[PDB]
Amino acid sequence: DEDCLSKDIKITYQELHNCIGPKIMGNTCVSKNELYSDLFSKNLVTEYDKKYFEPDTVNDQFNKIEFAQDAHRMILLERILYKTECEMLSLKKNSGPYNVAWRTYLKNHNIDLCSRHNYKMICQCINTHSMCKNTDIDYNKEIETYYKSNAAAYRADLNTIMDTLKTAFRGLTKVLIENYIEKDDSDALKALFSNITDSVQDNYQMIGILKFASKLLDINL
Ligand SMILES: *[C@@H]1O[C@H](CO)[C@@H](O[C@@H]2O[C@H](CO)[C@@H](O)[C@H](O)[C@H]2NC(C)=O)[C@H](O)[C@H]1NC(C)=O
Ligand SMILES: [Cl-]
Ligand SMILES: [Cl-]
């Protein structure tokens, strides 16, 4: 698994799936100077990169990634953010202010499916933080029946879920999501959601949200 900083200038959006925060992040948040010495000693950054390791707020790092016009720059800034910003580590778990952020944003303006069908697993996952393991399983295809009869609620709920995911995974993940959403690339979106799933297996509710998101993409209208 070659390092995202090792590879070439021409990078596909598909290869960038290896470089997203959830995947490169571990269980630690080192200082930026320690990450710089670490990557430098691996011949992955140079002194010309040192400016990218200076302190900055997390929102400004988000914007520097999400407006980046160079792929190597986007990869490096994502790596720095998710290796050095301690709050991001909460994404591998259930609790933390960063999880309550997207969690309350999602429950707040809920999805229309849950108004008339509060008993569906996705609705229990969103509202009561429970039953998140089975959110993609549609027993007797009741969820799919609902959406193809209420396309307004389908587009509203799909947009709400996409916005939830883009809020939870600022940076490269959000760039990729917006890219595929504009290209109408549902296969790529399901592949990205699958890749994220592999990296956040201990984020119960977020696993539920990703499963449900992939299910919604199967519902093709
Ligand atoms: C992320 O997930 C995607 C899809 O699950 C992976 O891409 C697939 O890899 C298999 C490996 O045999 C291929 O047969 C498929 O053609 C690939 N694409 C799809 C759409 O299934 C990918 O390997 C995962 N990891 C990344 C991108 O780092
Ligand atoms: Cl469960
Ligand atoms: Cl879990």
Numbering used by the authors: 482 to 702
From the paper:
The OBV M segment encodes two glycoproteins, Gn and Gc, derived from a single polyprotein precursor, with Gn encoded upstream of Gc. Compared with other bunyaviruses, OBV Gn is relatively small, with an ectodomain of about 200 amino acids (aa), whereas Gc, with an ectodomain of ca. 900 aa long, is about twice the size of its Gc counterparts from other bunyaviruses. Our structural analysis has revealed that this region is composed of two domains: a 27 -kDa α-helical head domain and a stalk that is divided into two identically folded 19 -kDa tandem β-sandwiches. Furthermore, the head domain is well exposed to the environment and is a major target of the humoral adaptive immune system of the OBV mammalian hosts, indicating that the trigonal pyramid of the spike shields the functionally more critical membrane fusion core machinery from the host’s antibody response.
In addition to the variable region of SBV Gc, we determined the crystal structures of the Gc head domains from BUNV (aa 478–721), LACV (aa 477–722) and OROV (aa 482–702) to resolutions ranging between 2.1 Å and 2.9 Å and refined the resulting atomic models to Rfree values between 0.21 and 0.23. Nevertheless, they share a common tertiary structure with RMSD values between 2.0 Å over 232 Cα atoms (BUNV:LACV) and 3.7 Å over 224 Cα atoms (LACV:SBV). The head domains of BUNV, LACV, and OROV contain each a single asparagine-linked carbohydrate chain and although the positions of the respective glycosylation sites along the aa sequences are not conserved, they project from the same face of the domain carrying the two glycan chains in SBV. The OROV Gc head domain did not crystallize as a closed trimer, but its individual protomers were arranged around a threefold crystallographic axis in a similar fashion as the trimer subunits of the BUNV and LACV head domains. This exception is probably not related to the pH, as all the three head domain structures were obtained in the same pH range between pH 7.5 and pH 8.5. The three protomers of the open OROV trimer are held apart from each other via crystal-packing restraints. Although this arrangement may have occurred coincidentally, it is conceivable that the molecules transiently formed closed trimers at an intermediate step of crystal growth, which eventually influenced their final packing pattern. Such a process would be consistent with our observation that trimerization is very weak in solution. Although the positions of histidine residues at the interface are not strictly conserved, there is at least one histidine with presumably similar function present at each of the inferred trimerization sites of SBV and OROV. Of note, the observed trimer interface area is well conserved in BUNV, LACV, OROV, and SBV when each virus is compared with its closest orthologs, in contrast to the exposed surface of the trimer head, supporting the functional importance of trimerization across OBVs.
